[PDB]
Symmetry: C2
Amino acid sequence: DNSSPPAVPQSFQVAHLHAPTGSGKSTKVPAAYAAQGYKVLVLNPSVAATLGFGAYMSKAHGVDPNIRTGVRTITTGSPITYSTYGKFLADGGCSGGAYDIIICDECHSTDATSILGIGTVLDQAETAGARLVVLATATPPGSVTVSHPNIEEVALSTTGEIPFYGKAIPLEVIKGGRHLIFCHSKKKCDELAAKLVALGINAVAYYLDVSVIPDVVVVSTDALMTGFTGDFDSVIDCNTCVTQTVDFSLDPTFTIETTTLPQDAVSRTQRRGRTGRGKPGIYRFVAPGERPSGMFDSSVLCECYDAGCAWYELMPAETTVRLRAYMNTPGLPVCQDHLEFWEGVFTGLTHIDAHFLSQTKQSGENFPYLVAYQATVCARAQAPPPSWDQMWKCLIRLKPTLHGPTPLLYRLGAVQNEVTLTHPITKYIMTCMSADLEVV
Amino acid sequence: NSSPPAVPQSFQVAHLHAPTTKVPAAYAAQGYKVLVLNPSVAATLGFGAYMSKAHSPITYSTYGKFLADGGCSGGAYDIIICDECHSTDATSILGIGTVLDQAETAGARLVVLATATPPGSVTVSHPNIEEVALSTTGEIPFYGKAIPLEVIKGGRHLIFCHSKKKCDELAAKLVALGINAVAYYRGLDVSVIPTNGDVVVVSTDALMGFTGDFDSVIDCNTCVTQTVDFSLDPTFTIETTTLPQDAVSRTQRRGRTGRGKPGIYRFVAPGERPSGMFDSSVLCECYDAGCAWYELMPAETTVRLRAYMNTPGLPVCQDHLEFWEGVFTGLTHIDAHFLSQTKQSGENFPYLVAYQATVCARAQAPPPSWDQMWKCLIRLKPTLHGPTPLLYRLGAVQNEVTLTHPITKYIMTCMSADLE
Ligand SMILES: O=C(O)Cc1c[nH]c2ccc(Br)cc12
Ligand SMILES: [Ca+2]
Ligand SMILES: [Ca+2]
């Protein structure tokens, strides 16, 4: 719809704002609405960003916004409120009468919190008195990377002294002094570094804490992020990423696993973006292509339901309503319509052990509810967990429960113990798979 | 790029992002011998002359024929136009990769990669077609939403479903409500009503083209596609998945209505998957086809596919070239008579099927099942002797399996070593 900030209408509308993010989607835009006399909520996926906007508004313009994050909450009364999706979700969502305008910044984000948070805004904002929701991103669905004036991009050839994802890095260009290199996994961040900390070029691997630079060559996963020492002269990109996916493996039910894929445009623009910051920069790549942005995996829907039940006190049917509003809204990332299936499985998961759930939550496991629940049925059948990986630590108490086969609900990682596939909850999920997933 | 690249002085690869004959004639006026490649040379509408019809400086052929001809012959062309270069069928990908690898050595000075739908393309509005979201209100349940009887009672309508089974079930529900509903899917008669009267065609993505009326299209916005699973049981599985449709698919389904007269498009999902990626099973297909059809050693197939993957502006895929090249290299001594048979039957992976049958016949062991795929072995009696030496899964497996054939172990090792 808009490449500029949409005016406030007289009846509720959902507007799309597609703008370069240097143009202050998170600063200039909410400030313009504020100057007009509106109360504006600004949502972002990351805690750092949210605090980072608050600071900039206090320092560069003397405006002290409300800040709302899990770790810290500041209330000044300013018409501008900065919050994370997660904190917005924990706050219970849209507070009646609070906001005239809600900006969903980085609306391209496909982590579970962002999707459930935006779904919630689209379900609730009109009823709560907002006149206008703005879905703001620099990279709408279908976006590909465009050229950058102060970054020249050069294909790697197979000629060179370092083996790199089927191609070669000529020894020179990483002796310029100032370099970031992206590898898909941890295991090959060491192996790649060590294949030249032993060669002496001086290199360190990131995935822990920070350890770098004013020379140096950093090789890291995506666990480093967009800021820090923006001075690099070149980036070298393997152009692939590790993503979470669900397999309906029927063994007995589903598996959450990881796949290595070609990077999408969001990934490529961002990795390339850590050079050419003022200076001229060079981008070197294994592969010229990229998936367009705008698709996400059904395993992320699973996560939304997991967080609904674990963090936000949402019955699955309520999470479905929020996600349904997301899925019905045009110009947002798309996924398989598996709402019925996941509402289905989580609704069958009754009488979870509160102590286990309040152990997996603190642990930072990805699916605290699913984990605590498998552990729940394990304890009550006096069976062992599916393995003695760290995920299952809430059960340390091998001793009574080592009685036999694990009653396996689903696969969240590697399964080491022998299993039994006949538990009523397992049969229940299988029936939900028949009921709610299509065939052929 | 929107306009036809002027012929340069050295060899290069250009991209023509043209919207929905055009350009080739222009290059032919200038003395240039041009070759134009498509998936098919049949009339794009389903009616009219073939593209190869003579009236020459311009040849019209297909990627399939081009590959069978052995690719680029001599200095026979200055300009090669790869049209519909967004196509991700195996023949198109191997065909384009062949052009890119051979064109310059064959003395061509320009390769045009033309498509109306570059990577990242999204479906755009149609001046002539009104689009309306289905609600959950209506008599006919449809992929989680509902079709109201009112919008298909009377008139002519096309409903897309993702499978044969869904088409039968939906048509039966319509007929029971008094609608003249007809199921269409491959294997059928174009018995879609002859005429002009009310009809609701319930169809898969068979039926292309055609000649229907259709005041409206209703779209499930779902597709079925082929995927490889690296399932370690023992090795990999070729399977079929349902995914959200991509922009190509939505545009094409919506384009059955609003031809001339205004039309109405009704949908289950507002969004599509952006176009521009394909599965690793397609790579596997390319090597299979290289070995069965085109007499290509796996390393020759790799060379062509690598050229494709180094070329910007084309659909992307996982880099499994070394993996697939490695498994086909191990597949030695295939039974020739079996390969002939799976080639004639139109199996999707004739080399892989025949090779599994070759391993069965030698161990005098039965096929993984007695589905039609395995009928080269049908001289059955001596062979049912025990477990199946299972190399990979190309379908459902009914027989008892054994996982210790050396070729199974070989492929497992390729998986360990070539797949991260
Ligand atoms: O920590 C944040 O502010 C974001 C967030 C992500 N997930 C959350 C769950 C609860 C609460 Br409170 C907050 C979050
Ligand atoms: Ca699978
Ligand atoms: Ca699998």
